[PDB]
Design a protein around this ligand. Sequence first.
Ligand SMILES: [Cl-]
Ligand SMILES: [Cl-]
Lengths: 200, 204
Amino acid sequence: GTEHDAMRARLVDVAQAIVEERGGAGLTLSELAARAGISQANLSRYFETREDLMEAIADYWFHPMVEIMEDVLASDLPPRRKMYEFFARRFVVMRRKWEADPVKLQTYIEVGNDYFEQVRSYIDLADHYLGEIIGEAMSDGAFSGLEVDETISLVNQMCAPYCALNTMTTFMERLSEDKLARIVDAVFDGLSAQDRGARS
Amino acid sequence: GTEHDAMRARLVDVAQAIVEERGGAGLTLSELAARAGISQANLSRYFETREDLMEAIADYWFHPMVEIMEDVLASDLPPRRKMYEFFARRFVVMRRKWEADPVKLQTYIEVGNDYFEQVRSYIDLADHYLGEIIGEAMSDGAFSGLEVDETISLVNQMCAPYCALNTMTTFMERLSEDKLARIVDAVFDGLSAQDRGARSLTGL
Ligand SMILES: [Cl-]
Ligand SMILES: [Cl-]
């Protein structure tokens, strides 16, 4: 029932942790069982085959980040607050991983990129949710003259170190919640279709 | 004199091309003279040893980018225009490499990454010049309440795909001068020390 599905989700979480510890390859049903405190026979009740475990870890890889985005969009926060939290909450989790072990963040990025369907789905879903925020912001009068698609691109290009994991890795020591707050304020109060002299 | 310095720069350019193709591992000093058209003895007048040549190659690696930054800073453009040109003119040269062949840009990145001191120096000089643009903008009234150091960091963080080469590579297909112009306008009209609601309801 729900206790079974709660346990399966808990096992997938332990499996993701082992993958990160090992630097990618080396996950076995043997070690998962040993780490989870269950037997190999009991583990097969949750993962019938090794392949099912491998599928589960791939499907769950970016799920924690998806949940964070879903929670932010489901909140009652105004668009500016939503945009900040949309990036900030994910940044905080990734920074924590890097603070504990920079190699675990490296592994997280490397493994994630090998999961074709999942990483592409995640990136696409992220843009979809960013669009929902931008659309509401526009009804409030922000981003005057811009289309949602071009604004999604502009925001992704202005917030890259707080979102794109390879950029985040490069900039990590210089990143902060204080700086991201400044950026989001600058996006909201500075981004529009009105040419203001950058080129003329 | 002036002739000696032109030939030395020609030799550094040829040597740089050889290093990009094969590394220093393939930089035959007899071939540098042979591929530049001069004598090996005549090549000794420009570089005493191989170490002198390798240092010249490393020291000039980022010079095209330095020249661009110096040209922008030396101009009479207002700070907003300077900030745009400071990023755009370098971006345009990098995109041009990638357009010729994405491998050309990757090679430029990897070879440059080995010159760790020269990379560091370049970034430091870049921050110096961006700092000068920011200082002038501040005198005009921009970036109210912010310090120069934190503003340099904030601008670098907002323009990262147009400057950080690995990020530029990833974003390349989606980058444009039009988009960079929008970002610079947003930096100038949007960035300041006044909290405006990103982090709490009090700011809104
Ligand atoms: Cl983009
Ligand atoms: Cl920075």
